[PDB]
Design a protein around this nucleic acid. Structure first.
Length: 221
DNA sequence: AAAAA
């Protein structure tokens, strides 16, 4: 899940999670309009602080000063709560990245075919994220990562990993500051949306190039 | 201290 789509209005996503009284997010009717969201860009990221939901543009990627590699973009759910690197983000930096769906490339010989993956019921997805707070500082090295899970049932046909997607109710509980890291692991386990709830279809190979941003990139070929 | 083109 190193690319996804985040194209609808803020309200299209937020309406499933919280009413205005729970937000500290200015109203904006403009569609976010991103059909091809890539690592290293800032991405609108949802989190909870001061008992309200906030939406900040956060660097997709995580590379601390002692990190000598390209920034990581994913954290494995099997070990993130335990990892020396990720445990602090699991404790303090939980967030939600909402999206329309995500892209994965199925390797077929030496060729790669992209797929777009989305909820069969038409709802947006709420991907579990962890990252470096305070999110609102706009850091360009220590941002957020998307938590991954082992691909299950049908998704294994495309790729061996998938984003950890939470139900709207679990997404809300995941973001709460007053729940512990062990509570968050319970929420991740019980709130995970199973693979049977997703559909997918091949898309244009044009999505490979981050310059391309058209609505057609999520349409079937 | 780990996991897209």
């Amino acid at each position: 899940c190193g690319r996804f789509a985040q194209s609808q209005t803020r309200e299209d996503y937020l309406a499933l999670l919280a009413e205005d009284i729970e937000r500290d997010i200015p109203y904006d009717p403009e569609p976010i309009g991103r059909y091809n969201v890539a690592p290293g860009t800032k991405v609108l990221l949802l989190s909870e602080r001061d008992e309200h939901l906030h939406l900040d543009p956060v660097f997709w990627g995580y590379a601390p000063g002692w990190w000598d590699k390209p920034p990581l973009i994913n954290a494995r759910v099997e070990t993130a709560a335990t990892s020396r690197m990720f445990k602090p983000l699991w404790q303090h930096g939980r967030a939600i990245c909402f999206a329309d769906g995500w892209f994965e490339w199925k390797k077929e010989g030496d060729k790669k075919q992209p797929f777009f993956i989305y909820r069969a019921d038409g709802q947006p997805i709420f991907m579990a994220a962890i990252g470096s707070t305070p999110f609102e500082r706009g850091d360009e090295a220590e941002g957020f990562l998307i938590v991954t899970a082992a691909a299950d049932q049908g998704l294994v046909d495309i790729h061996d990993r998938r984003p950890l997607v939470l139900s709207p109710e679990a997404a809300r509980e995941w973001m709460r500051q007053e729940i512990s890291g062990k509570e968050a692991s319970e929420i991740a386990a019980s709130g995970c949306v199973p693979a049977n709830q997703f559909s997918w279809h091949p898309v244009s190979r044009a999505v490979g190039n981050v310059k391309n941003q058209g609505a057609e990139l999520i349409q079937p070929v």
